[PDB]
Amino acid sequence: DIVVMETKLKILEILQFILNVRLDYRISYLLSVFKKEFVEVFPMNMNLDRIGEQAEAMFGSMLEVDDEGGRMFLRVLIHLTMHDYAPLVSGALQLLFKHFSQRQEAMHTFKQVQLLISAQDVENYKVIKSELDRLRTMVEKSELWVDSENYQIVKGILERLNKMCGVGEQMRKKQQRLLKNMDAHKVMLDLLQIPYDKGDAKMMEILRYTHQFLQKFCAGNPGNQALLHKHLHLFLTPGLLEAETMQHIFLNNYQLCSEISEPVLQHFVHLLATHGRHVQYLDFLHTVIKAE
Amino acid sequence: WDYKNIIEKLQDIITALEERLKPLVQAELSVLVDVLHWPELLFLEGSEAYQRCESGGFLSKLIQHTKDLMESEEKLCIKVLRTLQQMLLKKTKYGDRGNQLRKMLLQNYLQNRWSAIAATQCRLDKEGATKLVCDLITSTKNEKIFQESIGLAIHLLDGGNTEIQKSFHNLMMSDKKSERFFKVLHDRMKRAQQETKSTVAVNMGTSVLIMQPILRFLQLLCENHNRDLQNFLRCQNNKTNYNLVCETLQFLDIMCGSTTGGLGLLGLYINEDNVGLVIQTLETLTEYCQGPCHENQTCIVTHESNGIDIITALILNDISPLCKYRMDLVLQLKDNASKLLLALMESRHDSENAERILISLRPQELVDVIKKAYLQEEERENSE
Amino acid sequence: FLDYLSDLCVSNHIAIPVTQELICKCVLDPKNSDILIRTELRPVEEEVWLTWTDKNNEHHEKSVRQLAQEARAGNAHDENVLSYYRYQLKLFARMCLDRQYLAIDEISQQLGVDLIFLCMADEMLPFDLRASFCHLMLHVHVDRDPQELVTPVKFARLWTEIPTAITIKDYDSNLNASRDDKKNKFANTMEFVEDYLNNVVSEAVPFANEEKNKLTFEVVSLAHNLIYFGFYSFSELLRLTRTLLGI
Ligand SMILES: [Ca+2]
């Protein structure tokens, strides 16, 4: 029955979430061990053997998802893989493959951990967290204020974030990494989807500021460029700001420009043929032609 | 707080942990192969799931799903193909810690329950691995999926398995899409030839790197002098026939520089990077001709490209640039060329092939080469 | 026709704000208040009563338990009114999909958390009605402004917020305040979900009854949404994994 398959899919999704929580706990444990050893060595050499032993031990335990030492989990995964529902089999296979890669996943996640120690870094983190939380809360209630003080506060938040993006190669890279870690791009993309009328100058200014922030986010960062390219469909609309954002996303990116799909390229020539608004489409094509 | 010092210590700890856990990661990944080998042991004997697992139903379902998910999830397809290839590989040791971890995991999951490679290959073929490989090669548009399919084919055919060769021949004959399979192989061969020609003209490309696995697969098809496969690779009896033997000879001729290489400029074209591919091509041609296959011998000897002159030059020429630095590779190349020439005349009572070879392989130079090779022993360095 | 409106509310399991708003502006309008069954709770500890206007504009009020009992007995009018109520609840849930606050604000006042919990937890009502109430609770109350999706893995961490020694209890105690605050509201729902899952796993064949399968699916979806909103700590998630795998 379809209901049973959907229930099993939801159970599998819950299992994925809990496994991610376990991964986060493992990363936290490793960080705590490292901090304890660092404090012991420097109250103001490092015994890496002890830390390695603790890391090995933590993968042995209370973190297991069953009382059979993972036997029940493996049995359930195999049984689900034997089913016909394609999404269920795919999820079971993904979980099965992830089961035997826990150490590799933990090391990969630990590599990406970012530590904020400087007071300026802590202040930046707090400010970004507060601003993003307020922006998300206000965007979630779009129907309440979308045609008030909401517009002014939103505009101030966008300007503050744009100024927070930073200036300088090292500063820009650090701020971009921090913003990626705080999921600001998701908030901005959700804001772009907000429904609005075409006769509101304030909303146009807000969208312009959002596009400026998005362009600054991926400026010179291939990782953020790919992250934004993952959501192309939003930007494929008849607009000038969207064309500028697409140009910035594809700017100096061989991996994206070279593998650009046919419909994306035909979109801009179609707009030129039917609209021909400005030189934004030509600029996008010119930047797409050359990369690195 | 020491920001720079803290970051440096964190990086050092990350590097140490990465170095330490590699054997454990390998052992943990390996345990998955054992789990896939005997899934029924996870269930209770006499149960429905146990019956499904024991009869190979799990592996067949996995292969069918892999075929289905080629377009839905390319990454999952690649992962499953790699897992199958690992399943077809020989066992390996991961150190004391790795072995301990592997044994502990096997005990936890499975409570207490070349011949092995051949049995595994036969089992996978029974579950439908060969059909999956053929379908993926014929239909896939992803380079990684094609590479994994070719690798799985090589692993299945590794060691010259007669049953796998028979299954491949049956699929090629009965199936209606064998024409597309051979067309894809021919198109890739031609693309590699064109890329090599362009690179030679300019003076190493995925289209050229892919030739090594393809040549290895074609050689494994004809291994042990399989007459049916040897003849099929030349003529498939379809509406349009693709002669892979002729294409292999053309690739060898283009790689070595064609007539210019035969004149004596062979040294420049052949270098350290591409020597292995030339060796593989020579081995594939030898496997085509040995047994013997008279039609393949005639095709190679009388080819319009005059690729036999390339082989004779390979034997006679010294390969001045490469031989100075890597003499072992030059010796291997000469040995492979001599083996190919011998295979071209395995059981031919007529002199046609002998005279054609002697046209370019003059006797005085051959005797001088033999004497030089004999005298080089005193200068030999430790090598296979 | 209520079902047709429900399909019109959504497309490909994704709510469309435009059509959703157009349907909400009409279905919930006061002029069209005679086509929706009114539900209330009265002391009579408390009983849920449904009042509806017949075709001839005749008011009829009856307890939900009485409706279920009569429908089980064999009466057809009670079965028809129960089916109409179920489809109305489905329409209400669909109109609130993807946080449609315009309809959520109106529906929440009429159907509170306590009323929906009482209706769904009752074992005397048919499984379909409990499933509808669970769906409404999921799509009206749980998916509201205060709740927000939580990323299980955090990449940016403060140096001053890393304890020297960490355990599961200490690990999950970092944000216990918010968890307790949301528990103050959803404790009954969480307890009901846990008890239902335990009962389902205890059964030899959890997916035998087709009617119970709908309620099981809604309970599982509610648990999924609660988990993804950070309503459970790591220890509770570990405990629940055993039950989920056993099911
Ligand atoms: Ca809304």
Swiss-Prot record, chain A:
PTM text: Phosphorylated by AKT1 on serine and/or threonine residues.
Locations listed in the record: Endoplasmic reticulum membrane; Cytoplasmic vesicle, Secretory vesicle membrane
Domain of life of the source: Eukaryota
Annotated tissue distribution: Expressed in intestinal crypt and villus epithelial cells.
Binding site for Ca(2+) 1: E140, E143
Family note: Belongs to the InsP3 receptor family.
Entry remark concerning the domains of this protein: Composed of a large N-terminal cytoplasmic domain (CD) followed by a juxtamembrane domain (JD) and a transmembrane domain (TMD).
Noted disease: Charcot-Marie-Tooth disease, demyelinating, type 1J: An autosomal dominant demyelinating form of Charcot-Marie-Tooth disease, a disorder of the peripheral nervous system, characterized by progressive weakness and atrophy, initially of the peroneal muscles and later of the distal muscles of the arms. Charcot-Marie-Tooth disease is classified in two main groups on the basis of electrophysiologic properties and histopathology: primary peripheral demyelinating neuropathies (designated CMT1 when they are dominantly inherited) and primary peripheral axonal neuropathies (CMT2).
Protein function: Inositol 1,4,5-trisphosphate-gated calcium channel that, upon 1D-myo-inositol 1,4,5-trisphosphate binding, transports calcium from the endoplasmic reticulum lumen to cytoplasm, thus releasing the intracellular calcium and therefore participates in cellular calcium ion homeostasis.
Protein name: Inositol 1,4,5-trisphosphate-gated calcium channel ITPR3
Organism in which the protein naturally occurs: Homo sapiens (Human)
Swiss-Prot record, chain C:
Domain of life from the UniProt record: Eukaryota
Modification after translation: Phosphorylated by AKT1 on serine and/or threonine residues.
Tissues with expression: Expressed in intestinal crypt and villus epithelial cells.
Compartments reported by the entry: Endoplasmic reticulum membrane; Cytoplasmic vesicle, Secretory vesicle membrane
Binding site for Ca(2+) 1: R99
Disease per UniProt entry: Charcot-Marie-Tooth disease, demyelinating, type 1J: An autosomal dominant demyelinating form of Charcot-Marie-Tooth disease, a disorder of the peripheral nervous system, characterized by progressive weakness and atrophy, initially of the peroneal muscles and later of the distal muscles of the arms. Charcot-Marie-Tooth disease is classified in two main groups on the basis of electrophysiologic properties and histopathology: primary peripheral demyelinating neuropathies (designated CMT1 when they are dominantly inherited) and primary peripheral axonal neuropathies (CMT2).
Role according to the record: Inositol 1,4,5-trisphosphate-gated calcium channel that, upon 1D-myo-inositol 1,4,5-trisphosphate binding, transports calcium from the endoplasmic reticulum lumen to cytoplasm, thus releasing the intracellular calcium and therefore participates in cellular calcium ion homeostasis.
Entry remark concerning the domains of this protein: Composed of a large N-terminal cytoplasmic domain (CD) followed by a juxtamembrane domain (JD) and a transmembrane domain (TMD).
Family that this chain belongs to: Belongs to the InsP3 receptor family.
Subunit structure: Homotetramer. Homodimer. Interacts with TRPC1, TRPC3 and TRPC4. Interacts with TRPV4. Interacts with SIGMAR1. Interacts with PML and AKT1. Interacts with IRAG2 (via coiled-coil domain). Interacts with CABP1. Interacts with TMBIM4/LFG4. Interacts with CEMIP. Interacts with TESPA1. Interacts with TMEM203. Interacts with BOK; regulates ITPR3 expression. Interacts with BCL2L10. Interacts with CHGA and CHGB.
Protein name per Swiss-Prot or TrEMBL: Inositol 1,4,5-trisphosphate-gated calcium channel ITPR3
Annotated gene: ITPR3
Residues included from the entire protein: 630 to 891 of 2671
